[PDB]
Amino acid sequence: APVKVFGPAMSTNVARVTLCLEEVGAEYEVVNIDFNPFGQIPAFQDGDLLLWESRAISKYVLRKYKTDEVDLLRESNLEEAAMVDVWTEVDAHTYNPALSPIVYQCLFNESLEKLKKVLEVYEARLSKHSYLAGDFVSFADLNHFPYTFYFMATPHAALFDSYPHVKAWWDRLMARPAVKKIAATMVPPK
Amino acid sequence: APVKVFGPAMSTNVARVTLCLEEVGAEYEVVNIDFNPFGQIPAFQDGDLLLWESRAISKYVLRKYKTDEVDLLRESNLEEAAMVDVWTEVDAHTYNPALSPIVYQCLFNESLEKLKKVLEVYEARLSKHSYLAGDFVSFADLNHFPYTFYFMATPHAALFDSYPHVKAWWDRLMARPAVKKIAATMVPPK
Ligand SMILES: *c1ccc([N+](=O)[O-])c2nonc12
Ligand SMILES: *c1ccc([N+](=O)[O-])c2nonc12
């Protein structure tokens, strides 16, 4: 029975969730709604269950449809899950925040030094591991996709070229069937 | 072998972690440091493992020392863990943000209408369940402690009295041995 996502497709918070759904091979429809006790978007129906908060929706999607093949949270492995969480929280508290000003400015219209300084660190991390959480893809890696997608529409895309391990890491992420499927979806309704 | 927490005791981000440690009965020292690749506080050493980001540190503490008796994340139970995450994310994105202005203003020196509106919802939630994540305490409940602790030092403490289920829920939280032990610790060094 298909699970349902409500919100705009191109929305960073929706794409986080459509991505997780694609990654685990779930069946799902996306409904765009107009104008759940804060009245929040995205929302997500799994039959009787209603969820809001795209982190909780995603971690739910990744738990419901976990296989040995597709295990992107890694809760079975203590140190692994810790690193998934650490870099999830770095995406949320440091990375995403550096990109937003530049996406807002530089698509609908300072923070570039913070990101250079953040990229030095991601570059170090990614020189010692395939992926952020260690030598395996995880939610941490997937979390970076929405905000970074839009960053590469801007004329500051080329900055990743001073951070080769970050370029290669990103390219690798762009290469994934799921990631591509969603990237297509991130458009206004015409 | 004791795990180690670095940071100021009275810090909201440190207390989140000392609380989780107390709740699970772990052995731990707290070191206050001066002036981990963003150089972040709090930090946490488990022998060879170093963690930063207090959400990841806490979720780690709660996983390492999970018992059948003390299971505050509930990853074994799909819907349960979803609700733990949902209300964790509500504390982070809505609740905590309503309190900070009032703690900053009204201890070192508008947002009161947002919180009234947030409290209406918590009151509803808490009228239908013992605790936020359903009829069992969890990380979600514990997450609220630091920022709310300081809110009740202010002259707006009495506002919880218009939200009885939220008053009773809070009182219940204040009653816990762990919660009290930490509350004692949340003082400057004299
Ligand atoms: C994006 C990038 C650069 C500049 N610029 O003037 O250097 C811009 N101005 O408006 N958007 C952008
Ligand atoms: C806290 C609470 C109220 C007021 N007030 O003037 O109404 C304050 N002024 O500075 N701190 C507070």
Numbering used by the authors:
A (entry chain AAA), B (entry chain AAA): 2 to 36, 50 to 119, 220 to 304
The paper states:
Importantly, just as treatment of MHR black-grass plants with NBD-Cl reversed resistance toward three herbicide chemistries, this alkylating agent also disrupts the drug resistance function of HsGSTP1 in human tumour cells. In both cases, the inhibitory activity of NBD-Cl was linked to the alkylation of specific cysteine residues, namely Cys47 in HsGSTP1 and Cys120 in AmGSTF1, which are respectively located on opposite sides of the binding cleft in different loop regions of each protein. To determine the structural basis of this covalent modification, AmGSTF1 was quantitatively alkylated with NBD-Cl as confirmed by mass spectrometric analysis prior to crystallisation (data not shown). The modified protein crystallised in the same hexagonal space group as the native form, diffracting to 2.8 Å, revealing a conformation that is almost identical in structure to the apo-protein, with rmsd of 0.2 Å for 188 Cα-atoms. The covalent modification of cysteines located in the binding loop clearly affect enzymatic activity presumably due to changes in dynamic behaviour.
In black-grass, upregulation of a phi (F)-class GST1 (AmGSTF1) has been shown to be a functional biomarker of MHR. Recombinant AmGSTF1 has been shown to exhibit both glutathione-S-transferase activity toward xenobiotics, as well as acting as a GPOX, reducing fatty-acid hydroperoxides to less reactive monohydroxy derivatives. Each protomer has two distinct domains; the N-terminal domain adopts the typical thioredoxin-fold, with the C-terminal domain being a bundle of at least five helices as demonstrated by the crystal structures of AmGSTF1 presented here.
